[model samples]
Target: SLQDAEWYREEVNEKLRDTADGTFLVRTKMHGYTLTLRKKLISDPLTFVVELINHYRNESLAQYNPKLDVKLYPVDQVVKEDNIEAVGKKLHEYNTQFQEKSREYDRLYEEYTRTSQEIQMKRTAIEAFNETIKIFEEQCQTQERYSKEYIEKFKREGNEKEIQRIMHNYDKLKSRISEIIDSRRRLEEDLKKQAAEYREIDKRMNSIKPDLIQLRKTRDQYLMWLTQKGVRQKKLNEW
Candidate 1:
């Protein structure tokens, strides 16, 4: 376990450091200036929540389908030679477009699979119900005959009322068929509810703007410090 933890930490840090350009935030004071870094805008605090939600939904889908495409957002895209405010604005805009485009793409790829699965589940439930109905129909065809024989045996054994009692037990079994029908109804409703919840999550995801605007402003402010520290641009080399 310890080795595994070390391996994971190494993997994460390596990935993060490689993309550190995108996530770095500059903070300056007489004490010192610190550069906060990560691999991408999505790895940055403000946008990370949105990226995480996307992964959460994606991983859930992967559990059922091994053929599904599995690509975590690359950590490299976040690095830039700019400030947080500028990058944040760009990331917010980029995320807005990405959420829409991703939806369109996923819809084309997975919509049919989802609809077909619903159809399959309902079809299976109906087939099961039909099988149960066929079984009971066969039982009913012979049930009356069995009832008469049961009455005769009960009379021979000296309990005249056992015939009606046996018939009532059969009636209780018929009620169990209603239970099967109810079970199918409940299962279908649950599927509908899950679909509704997914739609709600999608709606909320699209509305989140990734808070990049303020972050970009913060980024620019940091770059201003570098500018003030006599690190002139190469373009000003002659001046």
Candidate 2:
């Protein structure tokens, strides 16, 4: 919604007009930082608005999170002054640090989750191999019993070849089962290492969680201030 432009214009001008020598102090909180400035007013309202907009657009402004109070008072008047300019640089630096830590935490979390998934997949594969081993062992045993019966009942016939073939297949099955067992063992070891890594990362994330939460809270407050201030600025601009 558009604001009553005439009322806003009149209000700001009235404030400026009362100041001696057209000079006034501007005290504002933006984002999470407090800022103070003294400037001589220009009679042209548009020029004044434009200057204010430029000042608010600074990168440092994004880091300030404080009460949204913008006032104009005579230059000579004693006001609660803040080192707003200095605070802006420090806030910007802290914000950068918070962002970097956030990214690092995210990266670590991705790695941990991915490793956990790999462990699950490896475990599934091992279970599948266990089922196959059981089936293969049962088949080998059945073939051996049949071969033994054939050898005793028809020793002089060509039953020996069948027995040999059965024995050979049994050996192959056993060999395959051994390979599977070794592979499963290696997979288990890999999973143990991956699990340890995930735990280490989890610990790190937990240690930083409090600080990260605090940083986000501060940033959120700043965003709220910016949004409200922007709404008023928009109204002024419309006028």
Candidate 3:
């Protein structure tokens, strides 16, 4: 089992030098033989290998096993070394593209929110106006009925001044009612226009909803990949 110990140690040392990080296990082939070495709490691979050999020989030793070779590598480095740059480039592009889309989405969403608020405000105003109109109509109707009674009473009593005064009150109530009606009509038309504009903006924002969702998903995926790549490259001393 202790064959060409010097040559084996030297080969393991060379292999360990190429390792990305410490505590990494590596296998090496030397002079038609193989050996596995892992550096543990030691910087010198030769010392580690010698210590390992001595331990194996002295305790639970594999005296007859020369093929007890391990080849465990830094898996992160192995998996990502080749594709890190490509993935980084793609991630950059994803970030750049999504950044603009995200801004656009924000602007659109703000516009959408403003439109909704305006629509609600318009509805509230219309409701309040309708309530006021109801009160005005009730007042006008009461005035008309009261004046009609007084007018008939005055006509029979031959009181022309009182009859004219009641009629004047009735005419003023009718004029006020007419003005309220005109205002209600104008408000209703404005409400309809606001509703239409709200719908148009909502439809436009909805059309881009799918694209925004897709862009966010892709951006998140790229971010995850890029993070893994960073860890791998740091281990590889390429960061």
- Model 1, span 1-239: residue lDDT tens: 32222111343453344342232222224542222234222122344423344443335323434543332332213454356445445544544555555566466446445655765676677778778867876675567678778677648564646756877767866777667767767767876675665565555444433433334443444444444445655523221
> Model 2 over residues 43-99: C-alpha lDDT tens digits?
133354334534543422223334323333222111221443333344455567788
1 versus 3: better lDDT goes to: 3
Global lDDT of each candidate: 0.49, 0.57, 0.60
Location of the lowest summed lDDT over 10 successive residues in candidate 2:
72-81
**1 versus 2: better TM-score goes to:** 2
TM-score result, candidate 3:
0.51
In model 2, what lDDT does residue 155 have?
76
Each candidate's clash count: 15, 7, 0
Q: Compose the digit string of candidate 3's lDDT tens values, residues 115-150.
A: 788878878887888898798888878777777776
Best by TM-score: 2
lDDT for 61 in candidate 2 is 28
- Please rank every candidate by TM-score, starting with the best: 2, 3, 1
How many clashing pairs does model 3 include? 0
Error of 3 at 63 (Å): 46
Measured by lDDT, the strongest candidate is 3
- Candidate 1, superposed: residue stretches over 4 Å from native: 1-100, 107-112, 152-156, 184-239
